[PDB]
Design a protein around this ligand. Structure first.
Ligand SMILES: [Ca+2]
Ligand SMILES: [Ca+2]
Length: 319
């Protein structure tokens, strides 16, 4: 099996051509120009594009790395772009070892055979499509403007997002509800107001099989977009559902669900948050395995609070 090459651009061939020529890849189909950024919010006349400079990782930091400490969900920290659903999906995808391995090839780095070109594969329309990109990334004041990793010198996620931007036409096309446009397989939606009786099980089974799960809070008006609630949840913003466990708390079974804000910051402050004393009611060994005091965007909340505070849940069965 061989993935369909987007625009018939072959990674190996293009990389070798550049190496031989002693030059860095400059993608003719997706240039480091305003058109690749956007058309309105990120359009050529938008104040949001003010000061943007395209730079390869080598100009961003001293020792750029493709992957550091593995390609995981903590490497997904949203930038100045409204692509929370895409990022929630990518974060969820890192939990599926096999798929991630195909989406993010390891035959690339900033050390060996580096020529400023990288590639990724996307599950699209019942077919695998491979996309190449040069590594010039949008920056502002010396730092990545859009997605970035908690590790300042790690670039696989920044480059993956760019590849998504390329296949969709521009970064702005990644903005504006659902995994569908960025993933494959069939997507099933659930209204948390009227959940199936065995939803917790469904969630657990979906997680165990490697499906992608995301959830969000409906917004009243456009002004309510990204509004922060009393318990520090963000409205009209996609979150990845990354875990689900039923624990024994003070002698009672408690269904808990783990959620991750793709911002990589700003977490729920209700019961079961990282510093909640409720964790003292759980077996020390169990707690050690499930929670830690870290602002990484990931937190736990009871399934009950989840059902009460979130509006929708999407599950994308890759297989
Ligand atoms: Ca990493
Ligand atoms: Ca956390």
């Amino acid at each position: 099996e061989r993935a369909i090459k987007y625009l018939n651009q072959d990674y190996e061939t293009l990389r070798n051509e550049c190496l031989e020529a002693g030059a860095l890849f400059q993608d003719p189909s997706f240039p480091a120009l305003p058109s690749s950024l956007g058309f309105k919010e990120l359009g050529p006349y938008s104040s949001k594009t003010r000061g943007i400079e395209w730079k390869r990782p080598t100009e961003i930091c001293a020792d750029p790395q493709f992957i550091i400490g593995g390609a995981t969900r903590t490497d997904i920290c949203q930038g100045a772009l409204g692509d929370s659903w895409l990022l929630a999906a990518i974060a969820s995808l890192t939990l599926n070892e096999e798929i991630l391995a195909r989406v993010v090839p390891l035959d690339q780095s900033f050390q060996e055979n580096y020529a400023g070109i990288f590639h990724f594969q996307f599950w699209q329309y019942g077919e695998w499509v491979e996309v190449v990109v040069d590594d010039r990334l949008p920056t502002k004041d010396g730092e990545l403007l859009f997605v970035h990793s908690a590790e300042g010198s790690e670039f696989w996620s920044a480059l993956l997002e760019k590849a998504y931007a390329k296949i969709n036409g521009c970064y702005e096309a990644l903005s504006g509800e659902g995994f569908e446009d960025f993933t494959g397989g069939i997507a099933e939606w659930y209204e948390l107001r009227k959940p199936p009786p065995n939803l917790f099980k469904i969630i657990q089974k979906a997680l165990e099989k490697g499906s992608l799960l995301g959830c969000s809070i409906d917004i009243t008006s456009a002004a309510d977009s990204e509004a922060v609630t009393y318990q520090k949840l963000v409205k009209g913003h996609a979150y990845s559902v990354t875990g689900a466990e039923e624990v024994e708390s003070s002698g009672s079974l408690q269904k808990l669900i783990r959620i991750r804000n793709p911002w990589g910051q700003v977490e729920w402050t209700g019961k079961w948050n990282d510093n909640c004393p409720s964790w003292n009611t759980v077996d020390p060994e169990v707690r050690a395995n499930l929670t830690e005091r870290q602002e990484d965007g990931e937190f736990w909340m009871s399934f009950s609070d989840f059902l009460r505070h979130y509006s929708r849940l999407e599950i994308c069965n890759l297989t």
